[PDB]
Amino acid sequence: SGAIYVGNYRVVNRHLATHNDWANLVWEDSSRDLLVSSTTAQGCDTIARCDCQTGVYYCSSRRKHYPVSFSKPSLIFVEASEYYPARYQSHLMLAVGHSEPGDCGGILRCQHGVVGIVSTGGNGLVGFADVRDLLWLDE
Ligand SMILES: COc1cccc(SC)c1NC(=O)N1CCC[C@H](C(N)=O)C1
Ligand SMILES: [Zn+2]
Predict the structure, then answer these.
(1) Residue of 21, 33, 103, 130 marked active site
(2) Closest among 82, 78, 10 to 42, alpha carbons compared
(3) Can 33 be counted among the known catalytic residues?
(4) What are phi and psi of 101, to 5 degrees?
(5) Which sign does the torsion angle of CA 94, 99, 105, 106 carry?
(6) Using a 6 Å cutoff on CB, does residue 117 contact ligand 1?
(7) Positive or negative, the Cα torsion across 78, 35, 118, 48?
């Protein structure tokens, strides 16, 4: 669990989206595992606009923040799950680090702000769905 709250938007994992996220849908992309919904209150998270490859993420299965080097956003194959069939997920970044299924939603940050959120993992790896390209989140 976990979300990004910026202005009148809430960015969540598409597979974890609630009824209210769909009843107030702005944009959703199953290939990126992202869903953005509208909010009644103003959010205050700052989104980063950069090409950073180092940052810190929150791991709820360890109650700990961890520093990571991560890859540039790209198409990476993700094995079949109860949410999606076997496919390439786009705009995905990998790092060496611990993650478990309940870790989706944890924020990845750098000195410029919010980079993305935990979306995939396993075998000593962790995947993050990038949001730095969604320039509309700020306007
Ligand atoms: C069950 O495999 C894992 C093992 C450790 C950590 C994790 S992060 C939950 C996972 N989960 C995944 O990578 N999945 C399942 C959840 C949806 C993900 C997607 N982007 O389609 C793919
Ligand atoms: Zn940055």
Answers:
(1) 33
(2) 10
(3) yes
(4) -60, -40
(5) negative
(6) no
(7) positive
